[PDB]
Each structure stands twice: as structure tokens, then as C-alpha cells.
Amino acid sequence: IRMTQSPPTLSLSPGERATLSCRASQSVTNYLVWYQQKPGQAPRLLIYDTFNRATGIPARFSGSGSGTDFTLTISSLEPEDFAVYYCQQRSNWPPTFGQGTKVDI
Amino acid sequence: RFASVYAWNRKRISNCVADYSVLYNSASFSTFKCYGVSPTKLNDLCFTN
Amino acid sequence: VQLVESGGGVVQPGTSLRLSCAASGFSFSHYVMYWVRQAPGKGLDWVAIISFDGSSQYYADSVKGRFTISRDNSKDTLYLQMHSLRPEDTAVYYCAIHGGTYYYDKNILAWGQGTLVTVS
Amino acid sequence: LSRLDPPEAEVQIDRLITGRLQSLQTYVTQQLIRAAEIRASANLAATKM
Amino acid sequence: LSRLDPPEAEVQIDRLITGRLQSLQTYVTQQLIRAAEIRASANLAATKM
């Protein structure tokens, strides 16, 4: 059971929308969590369990997807929200984090 | 500890005041399926066993 | 919730180091914790797990046999006990919470803020 | 009505409506056939009077 | 009862029950209406005798 994030680095301006995909080696349901790690900070978590984001994360962050294919969407973040993103599962032991996707301009 | 399924445990209910809304709204349940009753009427219908 | 980790520094290849993780806020028992390393310039990868009392500890690759994780809820902390190390697992380390034991446990997740260990 | 919610109360209420309507229709048809027999008797009694 | 399990054969048996009941009750209504006509003919025959 190994995660993977297949879209590589992207160059989306401060505007527009971004859509990031995370797979799984087998069936995982409502068990993923998203992290946004800046250069040299602690990886801040984003989304509880595929659908509800935690406190202090705005509405432009959305998390969806099901089956074995999951997606995080930035509607229109802002002029800073460029970091690396990770998808993690809490189905069984232990929580694998995958690969990661950067964004540039 | 619970029991194994070949010998499932059982327990009846006697004179009581049984709450049912506070059991449902804990929001950690994999399956909560009520079949012959709606999950919103328990808080009001008496039973016999 | 809060998590404070301690035990970082510079060592030699073949010493030991007390990796301790202190928790408050939420109840430290009824809750599954684990560690996760990151070598600077890499992604993320886990170390070892402990299950709400010492009865079942799972380990990762190439850390089985140098790492003895133990918790003790009568003094509410967590330990890795890095022991007889290598000069290649210089990294940052985080203690995090897997979550949940009973039905009423209201699963929430939280992370530390890192502990840096370096070799010679 | 007490232990079901509208979507599934409706499917059970419709069978009761169907059965009771048919009961009522059988009653009314057999009253109409019997009133016509009483009318023949009352016409004969008028003619005898 | 040979190509359906009991939970699925109830729904198919009820469709037959409803139809056959309808047909039997139609038979019984039309006999009441035909007997009320034979009765008047026999009442006329008794008066002619």
C-alpha cells in the first residue's frame, strides 16, 4: 500500500485553479489527509478524511475524490500559497506519505 | 471485551429511561442502519422489550 | 493539543540519544502515537509505532534493532531511544498521533515541530 | 406515522389506502343491489294496498 | 417458488393474489346482478300460475 502523486511541478500564477491527484495501491476510503510544507517549516495539515478541512484553513481549499483516486483543489488561493503538498492515509499501519508535488511560477 | 460471533452475547432491557439521540450524534459509527423505525422517533416511543 | 519534543544535537556514529516527546492537552492514553523522520532535502517517511501501551510495536526498514520506542502514560511521554546509530540518519524527527482507540474518542490529528539530530 | 418518516411512511400508507378503498366499494355495491330488492317489495306492497 | 428466494417471491405472489381476487369478485358481482333478474322472471311465473 504505497501512495503516489503523479503530477509534477506546476507554474500556476497567483490566480486560476489548481487540481492535485493522489492515488493508492489498494482501496482506501475517507482516510486521507493533506499537508502543505513550506521551505523549512513544519508540515501543516489541511483536510480531515477527504472532505472537511481543519480549523484555520479557508474555504478555497477543498478536498474530494473517492475509490482510489483523490483530489485537492485550490480555487483561487492568493499570492503566496506555493509549497509542497503531501497525501497521507490512516487506513492501517503505518501512514505512508507518498512523493510530493511542488508548484512554481 | 466483546464476544466472538459463533457465541454472540445478549442482554435484555428492563425498567429504564433509555436515551437514543446521545448515542447517535457521536459521529464515529461505520454503520447506523435503522430498519423498522426511523432514527428520529426513538426519543419518544415506549417499547416492551 | 500540544506536542513538545526534545533530544537533538550532534553525536558520533555509534552513540545513543534520548528522543523524548511530551504531550498535554488531549489525554495521552487512548491514543496511538508514532515518529516520522525527514532528511533535509527529501520528502517524508515514518519510523516506529506504539499502541497505547506496550504490547505491539511495529518498525520500519533498517531501523529495526537500533530503535526501542516506548510510551508510559503514568508519566505521559514517548520515547524512541536512538541507540548505536549510523552516520546516515541525520535528520529531523516528529512525533505525531495516529488516533482513536474506542468509539467515543473523537479522532483529531496533530504534529510536533521537529527535533534535529546530526552525526560526525 | 410515529416510527417512520414521510418517504417510507408513504409506501406503507398506500397499501392501507388500497385495501380500505376496496372494502368500501364492496360494501356500497352490495347495498345498491339490496336496495333494488327492497324497492320491488315496496312496490308490491303499494299495489296490494 | 422455484426460481426466486422467499424475499423475492412474496412480491411476485402478491401480484397474482391481487389479480385473482379481482377476478373472483367480478364473477361474484355479475352473478348477483343476474340472479336478481332470474328472480323477477320466477316471480312473474308464479303469478301466471
CSV table of C-alpha atoms in Angstrom, one decimal:
chain,number,residue,atom,x,y,z
A,1,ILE,CA,0.0,0.0,0.0
A,2,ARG,CA,2.1,2.9,-1.4
A,3,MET,CA,0.9,6.4,-2.2
A,4,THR,CA,1.9,8.3,-5.3
A,5,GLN,CA,1.4,11.9,-6.6
A,6,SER,CA,1.9,11.8,-10.4
A,7,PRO,CA,1.5,15.5,-11.4
A,8,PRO,CA,5.0,17.1,-11.1
A,9,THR,CA,5.8,20.8,-10.5
A,10,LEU,CA,3.4,23.3,-12.0
A,11,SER,CA,3.6,27.0,-12.8
A,12,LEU,CA,0.1,28.4,-11.9
A,13,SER,CA,0.0,32.1,-11.3
A,14,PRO,CA,-1.4,33.6,-8.1
A,15,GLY,CA,-4.8,33.2,-9.8
A,16,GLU,CA,-6.5,30.4,-11.7
A,17,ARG,CA,-7.2,27.0,-10.1
A,18,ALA,CA,-5.0,24.0,-9.3
A,19,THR,CA,-6.0,20.3,-9.0
A,20,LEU,CA,-3.7,17.8,-7.4
A,21,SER,CA,-4.2,14.0,-7.6
A,22,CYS,CA,-3.2,11.2,-5.2
A,23,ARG,CA,-3.6,7.5,-5.9
A,24,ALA,CA,-3.2,4.4,-3.7
A,25,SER,CA,-2.1,0.9,-4.3
A,26,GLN,CA,-5.4,-0.5,-3.0
A,27,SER,CA,-8.8,0.6,-1.8
A,28,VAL,CA,-8.6,3.4,0.8
A,29,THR,CA,-11.8,5.2,1.8
A,30,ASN,CA,-12.2,8.6,3.5
A,31,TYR,CA,-8.9,8.2,5.2
A,32,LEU,CA,-6.6,10.8,3.5
A,33,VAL,CA,-5.1,14.0,4.9
A,34,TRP,CA,-3.3,16.8,3.1
A,35,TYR,CA,-0.2,18.6,4.2
A,36,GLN,CA,1.3,21.8,2.9
A,37,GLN,CA,5.0,22.1,3.7
A,38,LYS,CA,6.8,25.5,3.0
A,39,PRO,CA,10.5,25.7,2.6
A,40,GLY,CA,11.8,24.9,6.1
A,41,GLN,CA,8.6,24.7,8.3
A,42,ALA,CA,6.5,22.1,9.9
A,43,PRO,CA,4.1,20.3,7.5
A,44,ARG,CA,0.7,21.9,8.3
A,45,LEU,CA,-2.2,19.6,7.9
A,46,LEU,CA,-5.1,20.6,5.6
A,47,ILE,CA,-8.1,18.2,5.3
A,48,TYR,CA,-9.7,15.7,7.7
A,49,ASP,CA,-10.6,12.5,6.0
A,50,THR,CA,-11.2,13.5,2.4
A,51,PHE,CA,-13.9,16.1,3.0
A,52,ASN,CA,-13.7,18.6,5.8
A,53,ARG,CA,-10.7,20.8,6.3
A,54,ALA,CA,-9.4,21.6,9.8
A,55,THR,CA,-9.5,24.9,11.6
A,56,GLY,CA,-7.6,27.8,10.3
A,57,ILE,CA,-7.8,26.6,6.7
A,58,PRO,CA,-10.0,28.8,4.4
A,59,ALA,CA,-12.8,27.7,2.1
A,60,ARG,CA,-10.8,27.9,-1.1
A,61,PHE,CA,-9.1,24.7,-0.1
A,62,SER,CA,-11.3,21.8,-1.0
A,63,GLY,CA,-10.7,18.1,-0.8
A,64,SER,CA,-12.6,15.4,-2.6
A,65,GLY,CA,-12.2,12.2,-4.6
A,66,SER,CA,-13.0,8.6,-3.7
A,67,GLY,CA,-12.3,5.0,-4.5
A,68,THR,CA,-8.6,5.0,-5.0
A,69,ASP,CA,-8.2,8.5,-6.7
A,70,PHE,CA,-8.3,11.6,-4.6
A,71,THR,CA,-8.0,15.3,-5.4
A,72,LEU,CA,-7.2,18.6,-3.7
A,73,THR,CA,-8.4,21.8,-5.3
A,74,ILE,CA,-7.2,25.4,-4.9
A,75,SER,CA,-10.0,27.6,-6.2
A,76,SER,CA,-8.2,31.0,-6.0
A,77,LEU,CA,-5.7,30.8,-3.1
A,78,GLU,CA,-3.6,34.0,-3.0
A,79,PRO,CA,-0.2,35.4,-3.8
A,80,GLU,CA,1.8,33.0,-1.5
A,81,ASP,CA,0.3,29.5,-1.3
A,82,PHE,CA,3.2,27.8,-3.2
A,83,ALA,CA,4.8,24.9,-1.3
A,84,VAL,CA,4.9,21.1,-1.5
A,85,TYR,CA,1.8,19.0,-0.8
A,86,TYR,CA,1.5,15.5,0.6
A,87,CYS,CA,-1.3,13.0,0.8
A,88,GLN,CA,-1.3,10.5,3.8
A,89,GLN,CA,-3.5,7.6,4.6
A,90,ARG,CA,-4.7,6.4,8.0
A,91,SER,CA,-6.2,3.1,7.0
A,92,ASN,CA,-3.8,0.7,8.6
A,93,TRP,CA,-0.2,0.7,9.8
A,94,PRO,CA,1.5,2.9,9.2
A,95,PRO,CA,0.7,6.2,7.5
A,96,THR,CA,2.6,6.5,4.2
A,97,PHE,CA,3.1,10.0,2.8
A,98,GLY,CA,3.8,9.4,-0.9
A,99,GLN,CA,6.1,11.6,-3.1
A,100,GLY,CA,5.0,15.2,-3.1
A,101,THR,CA,4.2,17.9,-5.7
A,102,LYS,CA,5.8,21.3,-5.8
A,103,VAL,CA,4.4,24.4,-7.5
A,104,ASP,CA,6.3,27.3,-9.1
A,105,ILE,CA,5.5,30.1,-11.4
B,1,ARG,CA,-14.1,-7.1,25.5
B,2,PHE,CA,-16.9,-8.2,23.1
B,3,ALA,CA,-17.5,-11.8,22.1
B,4,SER,CA,-16.8,-14.0,19.1
B,5,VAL,CA,-19.6,-14.4,16.6
B,6,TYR,CA,-20.2,-18.1,17.0
B,7,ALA,CA,-21.3,-17.4,20.6
B,8,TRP,CA,-22.7,-13.9,20.5
B,9,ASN,CA,-23.6,-12.3,23.8
B,10,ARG,CA,-27.1,-11.0,24.6
B,11,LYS,CA,-28.7,-8.6,27.1
B,12,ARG,CA,-32.3,-7.6,27.6
B,13,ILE,CA,-33.6,-4.3,29.0
B,14,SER,CA,-36.0,-3.8,32.0
B,15,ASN,CA,-37.5,-0.7,33.6
B,16,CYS,CA,-35.3,2.1,32.3
B,17,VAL,CA,-35.0,5.5,30.7
B,18,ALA,CA,-33.1,4.7,27.5
B,19,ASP,CA,-31.6,7.7,25.6
B,20,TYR,CA,-31.1,7.3,21.9
B,21,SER,CA,-30.2,10.7,20.5
B,22,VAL,CA,-27.0,10.9,22.5
B,23,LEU,CA,-25.9,7.5,21.1
B,24,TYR,CA,-26.3,8.6,17.5
B,25,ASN,CA,-24.7,12.0,17.4
B,26,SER,CA,-21.2,10.9,18.5
B,27,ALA,CA,-20.3,10.8,14.8
B,28,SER,CA,-17.9,7.8,14.8
B,29,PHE,CA,-20.0,5.0,13.6
B,30,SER,CA,-19.3,2.9,10.5
B,31,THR,CA,-22.9,1.7,10.1
B,32,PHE,CA,-26.0,3.1,11.8
B,33,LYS,CA,-28.9,1.5,9.9
B,34,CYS,CA,-32.4,1.5,11.4
B,35,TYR,CA,-34.8,-0.7,9.5
B,36,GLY,CA,-38.3,-0.9,11.0
B,37,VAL,CA,-38.1,2.5,12.8
B,38,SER,CA,-36.7,5.9,11.9
B,39,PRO,CA,-33.7,7.1,13.9
B,40,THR,CA,-35.5,10.3,15.0
B,41,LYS,CA,-38.6,8.6,16.7
B,42,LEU,CA,-36.9,6.6,19.4
B,43,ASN,CA,-36.6,9.5,21.8
B,44,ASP,CA,-40.4,9.2,22.2
B,45,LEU,CA,-41.8,5.7,21.6
B,46,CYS,CA,-42.1,3.3,24.5
B,47,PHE,CA,-41.1,-0.3,24.0
B,48,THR,CA,-41.9,-3.6,25.7
B,49,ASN,CA,-38.7,-5.5,25.3
C,1,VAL,CA,-3.4,20.0,21.8
C,2,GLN,CA,0.3,20.5,22.2
C,3,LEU,CA,3.4,18.4,21.5
C,4,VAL,CA,7.0,19.3,22.6
C,5,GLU,CA,9.9,17.1,21.5
C,6,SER,CA,13.5,17.1,22.9
C,7,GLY,CA,16.8,15.3,22.4
C,8,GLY,CA,18.5,16.9,19.4
C,9,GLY,CA,22.2,17.7,18.8
C,10,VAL,CA,25.4,16.4,17.4
C,11,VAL,CA,26.6,12.8,18.1
C,12,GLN,CA,29.2,10.3,16.8
C,13,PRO,CA,28.4,7.3,14.6
C,14,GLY,CA,27.9,4.7,17.4
C,15,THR,CA,26.4,6.6,20.4
C,16,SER,CA,22.9,6.9,21.8
C,17,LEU,CA,20.4,9.7,22.2
C,18,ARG,CA,17.2,10.2,24.3
C,19,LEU,CA,14.4,11.1,21.9
C,20,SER,CA,11.5,12.2,24.1
C,21,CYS,CA,8.1,13.5,23.1
C,22,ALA,CA,5.9,15.2,25.8
C,23,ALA,CA,2.2,15.7,25.3
C,24,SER,CA,-0.5,17.6,27.1
C,25,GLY,CA,-3.9,19.0,26.2
C,26,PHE,CA,-5.7,15.8,25.0
C,27,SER,CA,-5.5,12.7,27.0
C,28,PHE,CA,-2.2,10.9,26.2
C,29,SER,CA,-3.6,7.5,26.8
C,30,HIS,CA,-6.4,6.1,24.5
C,31,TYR,CA,-4.2,7.4,21.6
C,32,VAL,CA,-1.8,5.9,19.1
C,33,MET,CA,1.5,7.8,18.5
C,34,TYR,CA,4.4,7.4,16.1
C,35,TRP,CA,7.5,9.1,14.8
C,36,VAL,CA,8.5,10.4,11.4
C,37,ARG,CA,11.9,11.5,10.0
C,38,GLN,CA,12.9,13.7,7.2
C,39,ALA,CA,16.4,14.0,5.8
C,40,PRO,CA,17.0,17.7,4.8
C,41,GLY,CA,16.3,17.8,1.1
C,42,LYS,CA,13.9,14.9,0.9
C,43,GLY,CA,10.2,14.2,1.5
C,44,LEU,CA,8.6,12.4,4.4
C,45,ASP,CA,8.9,8.9,5.9
C,46,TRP,CA,8.0,7.2,9.2
C,47,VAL,CA,10.0,5.4,11.9
C,48,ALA,CA,8.1,3.4,14.5
C,49,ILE,CA,4.7,3.0,16.1
C,50,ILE,CA,3.4,2.2,19.6
C,51,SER,CA,-0.2,1.2,20.5
C,52,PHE,CA,-1.5,3.0,23.6
C,53,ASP,CA,0.6,0.6,25.9
C,54,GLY,CA,3.5,-1.6,25.1
C,55,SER,CA,2.0,-4.7,23.7
C,56,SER,CA,2.5,-4.1,20.0
C,57,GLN,CA,5.3,-2.1,18.3
C,58,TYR,CA,5.8,-2.1,14.6
C,59,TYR,CA,9.0,-0.9,12.9
C,60,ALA,CA,10.3,0.3,9.6
C,61,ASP,CA,13.2,-0.8,7.4
C,62,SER,CA,16.8,-0.5,8.6
C,63,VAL,CA,15.7,0.8,12.0
C,64,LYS,CA,14.6,-2.5,13.4
C,65,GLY,CA,17.2,-3.3,16.1
C,66,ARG,CA,18.6,0.1,16.8
C,67,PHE,CA,15.3,1.7,18.0
C,68,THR,CA,13.2,0.9,21.1
C,69,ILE,CA,10.1,3.1,21.2
C,70,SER,CA,8.2,3.1,24.5
C,71,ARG,CA,5.4,5.0,26.0
C,72,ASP,CA,4.4,5.4,29.6
C,73,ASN,CA,1.1,7.1,30.4
C,74,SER,CA,1.9,7.3,34.1
C,75,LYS,CA,4.3,9.9,33.1
C,76,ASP,CA,2.6,10.9,29.8
C,77,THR,CA,5.6,10.9,27.3
C,78,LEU,CA,7.0,9.0,24.4
C,79,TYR,CA,10.5,7.7,23.6
C,80,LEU,CA,12.4,6.4,20.6
C,81,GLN,CA,15.8,5.7,22.3
C,82,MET,CA,18.1,6.0,19.3
C,83,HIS,CA,20.9,3.7,20.1
C,84,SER,CA,24.2,2.7,18.3
C,85,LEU,CA,23.5,5.0,15.4
C,86,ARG,CA,24.6,5.4,11.8
C,87,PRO,CA,26.1,8.4,10.0
C,88,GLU,CA,23.2,8.5,7.6
C,89,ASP,CA,20.1,9.0,9.6
C,90,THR,CA,20.9,12.6,10.5
C,91,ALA,CA,17.5,14.2,10.0
C,92,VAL,CA,14.6,15.9,11.7
C,93,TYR,CA,12.2,13.9,13.7
C,94,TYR,CA,8.5,14.5,14.6
C,95,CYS,CA,6.1,12.7,17.0
C,96,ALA,CA,2.6,12.6,15.7
C,97,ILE,CA,-0.7,10.9,16.6
C,98,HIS,CA,-2.4,8.2,14.7
C,99,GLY,CA,-5.6,8.4,16.6
C,100,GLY,CA,-8.5,6.7,18.2
C,101,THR,CA,-9.0,3.6,20.4
C,102,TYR,CA,-12.7,3.4,21.5
C,103,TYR,CA,-15.8,4.6,19.8
C,104,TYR,CA,-16.0,7.9,21.8
C,105,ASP,CA,-12.5,9.0,21.1
C,106,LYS,CA,-13.3,11.8,18.5
C,107,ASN,CA,-10.2,11.4,16.2
C,108,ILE,CA,-8.1,14.5,15.8
C,109,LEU,CA,-4.6,14.7,14.5
C,110,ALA,CA,-1.6,16.9,15.4
C,111,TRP,CA,2.1,17.1,14.8
C,112,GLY,CA,5.1,18.3,16.7
C,113,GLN,CA,7.6,20.8,15.4
C,114,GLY,CA,10.8,18.8,14.9
C,115,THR,CA,13.9,17.7,16.6
C,116,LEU,CA,17.2,17.8,14.7
C,117,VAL,CA,19.9,15.2,15.0
C,118,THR,CA,23.3,15.3,13.3
C,119,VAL,CA,26.2,12.9,13.1
C,120,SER,CA,30.0,13.2,12.6
D,1,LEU,CA,-46.6,7.6,11.2
D,2,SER,CA,-44.9,7.5,14.5
D,3,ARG,CA,-42.0,5.3,13.7
D,4,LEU,CA,-41.4,6.1,10.0
D,5,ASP,CA,-40.5,9.2,8.0
D,6,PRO,CA,-42.5,10.5,5.0
D,7,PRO,CA,-40.7,8.7,2.2
D,8,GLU,CA,-41.2,5.3,3.7
D,9,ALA,CA,-44.4,6.1,5.6
D,10,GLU,CA,-45.9,6.7,2.1
D,11,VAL,CA,-45.3,3.2,0.7
D,12,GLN,CA,-47.0,1.6,3.7
D,13,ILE,CA,-49.8,4.1,3.8
D,14,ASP,CA,-50.6,3.4,0.2
D,15,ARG,CA,-51.4,-0.3,0.8
D,16,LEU,CA,-53.8,0.6,3.6
D,17,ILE,CA,-55.5,3.1,1.3
D,18,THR,CA,-55.8,0.5,-1.5
D,19,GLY,CA,-57.3,-2.2,0.8
D,20,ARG,CA,-59.7,0.1,2.6
D,21,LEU,CA,-61.0,1.6,-0.6
D,22,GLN,CA,-61.8,-1.8,-2.0
D,23,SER,CA,-63.6,-2.8,1.2
D,24,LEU,CA,-65.7,0.4,1.0
D,25,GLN,CA,-66.6,-0.2,-2.7
D,26,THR,CA,-67.7,-3.8,-2.0
D,27,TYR,CA,-70.0,-2.5,0.8
D,28,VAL,CA,-71.6,0.1,-1.5
D,29,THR,CA,-72.1,-2.2,-4.4
D,30,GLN,CA,-73.9,-4.8,-2.2
D,31,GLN,CA,-76.0,-2.1,-0.7
D,32,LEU,CA,-77.1,-1.0,-4.1
D,33,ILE,CA,-78.1,-4.5,-5.1
D,34,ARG,CA,-80.1,-4.9,-1.9
D,35,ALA,CA,-81.9,-1.6,-2.1
D,36,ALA,CA,-83.2,-2.7,-5.5
D,37,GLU,CA,-84.7,-5.8,-3.9
D,38,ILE,CA,-86.3,-3.7,-1.2
D,39,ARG,CA,-87.9,-1.4,-3.8
D,40,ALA,CA,-89.6,-4.3,-5.6
D,41,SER,CA,-91.1,-5.4,-2.3
D,42,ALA,CA,-92.3,-1.9,-1.5
D,43,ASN,CA,-93.9,-1.6,-5.0
D,44,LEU,CA,-95.7,-4.8,-4.5
D,45,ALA,CA,-96.9,-3.7,-1.1
D,46,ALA,CA,-98.2,-0.4,-2.6
D,47,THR,CA,-100.0,-2.4,-5.2
D,48,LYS,CA,-101.6,-4.7,-2.5
D,49,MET,CA,-102.6,-1.6,-0.5
E,1,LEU,CA,-41.3,-20.9,-5.7
E,2,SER,CA,-38.5,-22.5,-7.7
E,3,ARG,CA,-36.6,-19.6,-9.3
E,4,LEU,CA,-36.9,-17.0,-6.5
E,5,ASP,CA,-35.8,-16.8,-2.9
E,6,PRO,CA,-38.6,-16.2,-0.4
E,7,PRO,CA,-38.0,-12.5,-0.1
E,8,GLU,CA,-38.4,-12.1,-3.8
E,9,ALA,CA,-41.3,-14.5,-4.3
E,10,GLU,CA,-43.5,-12.6,-1.9
E,11,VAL,CA,-43.6,-9.6,-4.3
E,12,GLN,CA,-44.5,-11.9,-7.3
E,13,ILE,CA,-47.1,-13.9,-5.4
E,14,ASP,CA,-48.9,-10.7,-4.3
E,15,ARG,CA,-49.3,-9.6,-7.9
E,16,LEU,CA,-51.1,-12.9,-8.6
E,17,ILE,CA,-53.2,-12.7,-5.5
E,18,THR,CA,-54.5,-9.3,-6.3
E,19,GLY,CA,-55.4,-10.2,-9.8
E,20,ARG,CA,-57.1,-13.5,-8.9
E,21,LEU,CA,-59.1,-11.7,-6.1
E,22,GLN,CA,-60.2,-9.1,-8.5
E,23,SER,CA,-61.4,-11.7,-11.0
E,24,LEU,CA,-63.3,-13.8,-8.4
E,25,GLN,CA,-65.0,-10.7,-7.0
E,26,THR,CA,-66.1,-9.6,-10.5
E,27,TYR,CA,-67.6,-13.1,-11.0
E,28,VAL,CA,-69.5,-12.8,-7.8
E,29,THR,CA,-70.9,-9.3,-8.6
E,30,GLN,CA,-72.2,-10.3,-12.0
E,31,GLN,CA,-73.9,-13.3,-10.5
E,32,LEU,CA,-75.8,-11.2,-8.0
E,33,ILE,CA,-77.0,-9.0,-10.9
E,34,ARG,CA,-78.0,-12.0,-13.0
E,35,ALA,CA,-79.8,-13.7,-10.1
E,36,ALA,CA,-81.8,-10.5,-9.4
E,37,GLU,CA,-83.2,-10.8,-12.9
E,38,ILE,CA,-84.0,-14.5,-12.8
E,39,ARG,CA,-85.8,-13.8,-9.5
E,40,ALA,CA,-88.2,-11.3,-11.2
E,41,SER,CA,-88.9,-13.8,-14.0
E,42,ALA,CA,-89.8,-16.5,-11.5
E,43,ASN,CA,-92.0,-14.0,-9.6
E,44,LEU,CA,-93.9,-13.4,-12.8
E,45,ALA,CA,-94.2,-17.2,-13.5
E,46,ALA,CA,-95.6,-17.7,-10.0
E,47,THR,CA,-98.3,-15.0,-10.7
E,48,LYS,CA,-99.2,-16.5,-14.1
E,49,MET,CA,-99.6,-19.9,-12.5
